[PDB]
Amino acid sequence: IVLTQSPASLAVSLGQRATISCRASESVDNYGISFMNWFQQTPGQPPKLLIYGSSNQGSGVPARFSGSGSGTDFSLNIHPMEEDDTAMYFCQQSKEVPYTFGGGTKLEIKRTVAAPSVFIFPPSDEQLKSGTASVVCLLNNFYPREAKVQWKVDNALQSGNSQESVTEQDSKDSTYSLSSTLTLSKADYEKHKVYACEVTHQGLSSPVTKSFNRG
Amino acid sequence: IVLTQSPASLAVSLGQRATISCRASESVDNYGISFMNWFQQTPGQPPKLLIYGSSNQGSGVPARFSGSGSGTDFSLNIHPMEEDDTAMYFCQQSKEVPYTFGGGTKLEIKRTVAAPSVFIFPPSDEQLKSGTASVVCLLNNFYPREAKVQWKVDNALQSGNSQESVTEQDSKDSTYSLSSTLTLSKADYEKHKVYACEVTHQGLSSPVTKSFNRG
Amino acid sequence: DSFVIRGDEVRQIAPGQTGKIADYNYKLPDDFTGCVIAWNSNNLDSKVG
Amino acid sequence: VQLQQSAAELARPGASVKMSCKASGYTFTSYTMHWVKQRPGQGLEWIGYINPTSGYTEYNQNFKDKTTLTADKSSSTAYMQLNSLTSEDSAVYYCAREGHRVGPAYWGQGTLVTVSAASTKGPSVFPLAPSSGTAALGCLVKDYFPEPVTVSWNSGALTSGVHTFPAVLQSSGLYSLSSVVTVPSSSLGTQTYICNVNHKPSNTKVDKKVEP
Amino acid sequence: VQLQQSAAELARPGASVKMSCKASGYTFTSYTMHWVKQRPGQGLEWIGYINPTSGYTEYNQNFKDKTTLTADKSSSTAYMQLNSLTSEDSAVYYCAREGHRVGPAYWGQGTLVTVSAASTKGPSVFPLAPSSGTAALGCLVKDYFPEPVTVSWNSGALTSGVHTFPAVLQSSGLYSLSSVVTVPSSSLGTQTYICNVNHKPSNTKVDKKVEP
């Protein structure tokens, strides 16, 4: 059985109803009862059982979490959603011998769309001595996570050469932080002058480009 | 009062006895009389009162239908079975405030077991352009209803992706017809070559396979 | 015979009934020359959590 | 005894529907009115009944909260109001009058209530061409809403051997059906076959030819 | 119900690794033990389960060849044997106890397996200086093995605006990360900022000054 987890990435403000839906390839109802399970995993922690069976709640589970559904269509609902509910949720089946987990949903707290803080980092001179040059693009305190970062070296697009990192949502700021690193050998790095990072995001009406000249 | 009804589907030849037995959890008997009623519902028509009380016949009810029984056991008898008597039959109780209907029983005429006419249809090119492909398996002029339609995509068992539809019994041929559709995305459909429909039926010595390769 | 049951399954406490509670936990005979009383105890037997 | 009802009410989830049952051929002041639900291809569940003379309404335990029943003796009509509709409520409701000690004795036609989020969508029809005795072909009608869709062959010129399978509800909220027909092998290269599909809620009349 | 595991198993491809899961708070003989694989930042897949009293082992079809399960009731623990480790097998593995009709009901911490032929290498940290309100600066830590690295600013005296992005593994098998801080442009010429990088596996402690 393959478990499909409709919407697997949602953002909801405090006190809002959140629904995560799971669908199964085959019926998971057996012996009258349902054998479907919902697990919660906070970052850095082992998954914890929220809902064993279709509706029954696990140990130490607040009443906010609720499970419903029948046959192959199931839903997890958290209406009084609050702070530490930011976690990854899984829908799992126990009807057949191969236990299968759903895709998983990262439930995140919503905040109004913000304009990214864009800045650029030229490679350090001591790095240039070692024959490598890494130029960094910094996006600070922007929402949502969806953003397009493009490197422009002398008005040329580069792909397959950049590494991307994104931090987790801030507990207080509730805005993402994003870092793009473009790495090159020294000989190719000095071969061009204008290095730019272009960012496209919802909080920007048009793409914003920050450029610098080497030296 | 929960009502338990005799088999859901009855297959009897024309002019033969058709017996539908309905049992009640508590005694429907009260004030001497029996409040166990029998309803008929032709598809596309509202339910019609056949038998009010245990045995009294409703208005405009032919002599074919007869009601019998008492206490917690009741029966409906149709000896001169007629082609018009194809409908869905319910047993109902009127003793207590919650009027409870039976599970229902569909009456169909019996004929000789017929070998299904198997067919398969690949999706149209216009449909393929739409990014969705539906392959069809067709079963024409088969009796009885018991039939299994199995999808083999490159000799792989598929489940949870096929929808089956069954037509009502034909007026003259009196044989069922079935259509099972497997729906897939165009990229997923074009990743496989051999598509087969397996038909398991009573009238066949072995299941009948109908397979084609894409394009 | 005193016990606590779910609200819906009170309909299963009767002669000739079927279900999880009736067929597995407390089965009532067909004759049952007696009475059945049920009342809500949400305030008494339900605690937060 | 004549009972007349509304016609095929369709509502988005959470909405409220007020539904009418007109009565004629009897007093309507001396016989109570029952309302009963039937899900398609399923059994019947009694909703509840009203006394037209005295406004005493009693409902089934399952439907007590969601349903309100009233009467209007001036126009001789019964009203049923469903609040906070769900996908489960999509079913055919019947209004019946008491008779022969039967609760819902005399029923009136039947009215279909459909609850869904998706709106009207035009049907897309694709020809099932015969594979390369008796051969088969057809047409597939997918992604349409709501019922019904009337499909024929050659504007009804081809009727024998025609099987229009009942619609099936997909997970996307729409419906799809197959209209198939079997033809002799000698007519494949000679006669043109066209399926005509008509969807009146969407005003969509489409004629598609099927070719080998 | 406490489940305890080993920590930080590192192996070169082709080796074998043994995982031990101690159990406490229950008899350990009445509940089967399940093992679950999770690639970092990915979904979960069930590996297999073992019965304590009778060594009845069941495995997923995919992991049948490369996984072995043993149970020691004498010391009340379970062992997983992985053979021929490969780059895909690098993941966090959990041991769980059966309960509430759940296979993996009660989970115990988690043990990480890193499959790589690389060796211990010291990180190199580079001052990402401000470009010539508030501006941004930081440090780039590159070419270290393995994770993690403790990164701080002013020995923890600078916490506002500190973003230490999670590391990304490179094609060379080495890790790269960046730690950035936003500060007012007034303190660029006055306040001193130093990034502290600690990598215990290589025992590398570096303090790098950042200046415009």
Curated annotation (Swiss-Prot), chain C:
Q: What is the effect of changing K20N?
A: In strain: Beta/B.1.351, Omicron/BA.1, Omicron/BA.2, Omicron/BA.2.12.1, Omicron/BA.2.75, Omicron/BA.4, Omicron/BA.5, Omicron/BQ.1.1, Omicron/XBB.1.5, Omicron/EG.5.1; May enhance affinity to human ACE2 receptor
Summarize the impact of R11S: In strain: Omicron/BA.2, Omicron/BA.2.12.1, Omicron/BA.2.75, Omicron/BA.4, Omicron/BA.5, Omicron/BQ.1.1, Omicron/XBB.1.5, Omicron/EG.5.1
Annotated spans, Integrin-binding motif: 6-8
The protein's job, in short, is: Attaches the virion to the cell membrane by interacting with host receptor, initiating the infection. The major receptor is host ACE2. When S2/S2' has been cleaved, binding to the receptor triggers direct fusion at the cell membrane. When S2/S2' has not been cleaved, binding to the receptor results in internalization of the virus by endocytosis using host TFRC and GRM2 and leading to fusion of the virion membrane with the host endosomal membrane. Alternatively, may use NRP1/NRP2 and integrin as entry receptors.
Q: How does it assemble?
A: Binds to host ACE2. RBD also interacts with the N-linked glycan on 'Asn-90' of ACE2. Cleavage of S generates a polybasic C-terminal sequence on S1 that binds to host Neuropilin-1 (NRP1) and Neuropilin-2 (NRP2) receptors. Interacts with host integrin alpha-5/beta-1 (ITGA5:ITGB1) and with ACE2 in complex with integrin alpha-5/beta-1 (ITGA5:ITGB1). May interact via cytoplasmic c-terminus with M protein. May interact (via N-terminus) with host bilirubin and biliverdin, thereby preventing antibody binding to the SARS-CoV-2 spike NTD via an allosteric mechanism.
Protein name as it appears in the record: Spike protein S1
Q: Lineage of this protein's species?
A: Viruses, Riboviria, Orthornavirae, Pisuviricota, Pisoniviricetes
First-to-last residue of the parent protein present: 398 to 446 of 1273
